[PDB]
Design a protein around this ligand. Sequence first.
Ligand SMILES: [Mg+2]
Length: 111
Amino acid sequence: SPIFGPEEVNSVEGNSVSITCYYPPTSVNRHTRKYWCRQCITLISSEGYVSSKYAGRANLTNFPENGTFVVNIAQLSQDDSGRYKCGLGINSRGLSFDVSLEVLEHHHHHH
Ligand SMILES: [Mg+2]
């Protein structure tokens, strides 16, 4: 478990959420591709790829000195609840961490 992050993240429909994953701050790690995928299909990476579902509604930023990268996701919907992975390199390399995202429903506002 070299990489570390939030095992579980809960949010409410309509919110914005940020997910921070940590990795050894060594050169290879620092410059290798960072990715966020849904259990695993790439949704956004540090190598210029941004899926259509995420285009404009999310971001992925790398902070090498810290050995971290952050995925910001906005306007969370019921479609976003699920299992994801944040990792380095290629998806099937396994060098990742599993994150469970639960988007709690937004109840109506009476009273
Ligand atoms: Mg409300």
